[PDB]
């Protein structure tokens, strides 16, 4: 029976989840969960009341857990008491429990995972290879440095929030989220061939034009899917795409990605290390991100592909690149780039976002070009 299970096996115990996720989960008055305060090193009962989460420290003495009333030898017993009696958590607050909010299917225990070697560094910190102990599934593990500013750490679970919703052959699969203890991890499929930029540079002259077109076609299919889900990626670049053992491309690094039903994300203005040279002018100038700015990014990706991993605007700083683009400046046609592909790239970088092609158009055009290779 449930109440006899340890706290760490309870459906309504959410461990090290951050406050922003708590606020997401607590929807109706009386919705609650129990978690660990990483700072205070105490258990906390978080409950929605008058529209906002309220956080109550669970006291312990003589191995009995309590608030301002009776004590119990376990937190599940305390929770059962409060729920069954409908007693306010404190006389002063009047807060009453109504509904235990359970973990979703994506939560993974730390004990389910073994971390391997570092494979990358992202904006939040290191990315590791790893394995699931139950079956030896190889995984990629995204971590978050503790010293990052609170406002940025609050964005760490965005990649998981987004990828939980998706399933497509050209988008990296989420496996789980390790939020029951610190350190918190996001666990994804391991795409064994690594990043596409390194692939282009390493395999270089071995790659046939037909293969290059299939790989950017994969990217285009991934982007068409994301658009269909109202997802604006914002960080599309060759180095953020991964290559499988069979040279299938998958889009990765969703940390910046935003879901917007009406198709436009207005940036905070506070983003650091913005990928300027991959970003559309309206996105930088006015903070307007959309699938149309992702199309701009896609044009840069196409340039990266057909240059076999050249660095864009190599003789310009980020500020100089913005000034260059405002003057009409664009990247030159790579030697190996078919005329039709360059024409498409040029359309991706139309100054006005409304003049850029759709991802469906891009995918169909790339496919038609490949069929003559």
Residue numbers in the entry: 449 to 821
Show me the paper's own sentences about this structure.
We have solved the structure of the prototypic SH2-kinase unit of the human Fes tyrosine kinase, which appears specialized for positive signaling. We investigated the structure of a polypeptide from human Fes comprising a linker region N terminal to the SH2 domain, the SH2 domain, and the C-terminal kinase domain. The three structures were determined in complex with the ATP mimetic kinase inhibitor staurosporine and were refined to low R factors and acceptable geometry. The SH2 domain, the kinase domain, and substrate apparently interact cooperatively to yield a functional Fes kinase complex.
The initial structure of unphosphorylated Fes SH2-kinase revealed an active conformation, which was stabilized by two sulphate ions that mimic binding of a pTyr ligand to the SH2 domain, as well as activation segment phosphorylation. This structure was well ordered, showing productive interactions between the SH2 and kinase domains, and we were able to trace the entire chain; we refer to this structure as “active. In this active configuration, the SH2 domain is stabilized by a sulphate ion, which mimics the phosphate of a pTyr ligand by coordinating a conserved SH2 domain arginine (R483), as well as R467 and S485. In addition, a sulphate ion is coordinated by Y713 and R706 in the activation segment, thereby mimicking autophosphorylation. The SH2 and kinase domains form a stable unit linked by the N-terminal region of the SH2 domain and polar interactions between the SH2 domain helix αA and the catalytically important helix αC. The N terminus of the SH2 domain (462HGAI) intercalates between the central SH2 β sheet and the loop region between strands β4 and β5 in the kinase domain. The second major interaction site is formed by a network of acidic residues located in the SH2 helix αA (E469, E472) and R609 in αC of the kinase. This arrangement suggests that the interaction between the SH2 and kinase domains positions and stabilizes αC in an active conformation, as indicated by the salt bridge formed between the active site lysine (K590) and the conserved αC glutamate (E607), as well as by low B values in loop regions linking this helix. In contrast, the sulphate ion occupying the pTyr-binding site of the SH2 domain in the active Fes structure formed a network of salt bridges typically observed in SH2 domain phosphopeptide complexes, correlating with stabilization and ordering of the SH2 domain and αC. The activation segment in active Fes showed significantly higher temperature factors than in either of the Fes-substrate complexes, indicating the stabilizing effect of substrate binding.
